[PDB]
Amino acid sequence: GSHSMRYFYTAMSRPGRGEPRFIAVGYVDDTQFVRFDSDAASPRMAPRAPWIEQEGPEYWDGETRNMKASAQTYRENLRNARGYYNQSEAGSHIIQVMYGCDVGPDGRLLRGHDQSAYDGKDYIALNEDLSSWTAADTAAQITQRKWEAARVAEQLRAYLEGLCVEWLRRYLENGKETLQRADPPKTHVTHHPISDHEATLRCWALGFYPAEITLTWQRDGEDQTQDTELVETRPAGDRTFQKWAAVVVPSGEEQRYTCHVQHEGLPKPLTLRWEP
């Protein structure tokens, strides 16, 4: 149904270790399709998905030039930001940017994003309106004023409404077989006794795409949100993801617990129990 395109930029300074490293990664939903690393032997925007390989020389050359220009701008940004925070020239600092578009099943713009961070804290974000900014502090207000004077928000909105939407629609058609295919999780429940009176029920979900999923445990039809150990969704290495949810139950009460699974790839939410 609905899709997203995102570019993730990391610019990290390393004083005494050369110029800041600039890394850009492009994603369509949970599929990476491009990368650019200034630390590569020969930095270029490089394919990371088969469906992008078909893009011509004008694409790759246009994108490589844009990345090198972005790398230069973010190297200057790191100098400015250090100044805006009255920071030492010895410390290592990080600027991060995440931007892109969300489209619906019709491929129409749902919403646009352009968020920036400085040392892992929010710095400036383009608002849902794609016309104003949210500066996190007085330093980010200086950036705001420079952007409000250059009307950067207009140029962003024009990219986010035009190019971002147009290109993502094209990628979705090119990567039709994978990007528009949801793989449901392969599910099962494991049982591990802890003591004489306790046991762990683990609800597994494997081989699913995209990463978004809901795994919950219910005891007598009541969510066990507090007592549920939920691991972070993890990539398998083959496009797919894995997750588990565990609950510690009293021995003999196993049949009162149900695991609930919600995933895009499933026609209806699954309900599973430990089958001894």
Binding site: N77, N80, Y84, I95, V97, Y99, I142, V152, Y159
Partner: peptide
């Protein structure tokens, strides 16, 4: 396709 927009801090 990446943003061709210069974001100078």
């Amino acid at each position: 396709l990446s943003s061709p927009v210069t974001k100078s801090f």
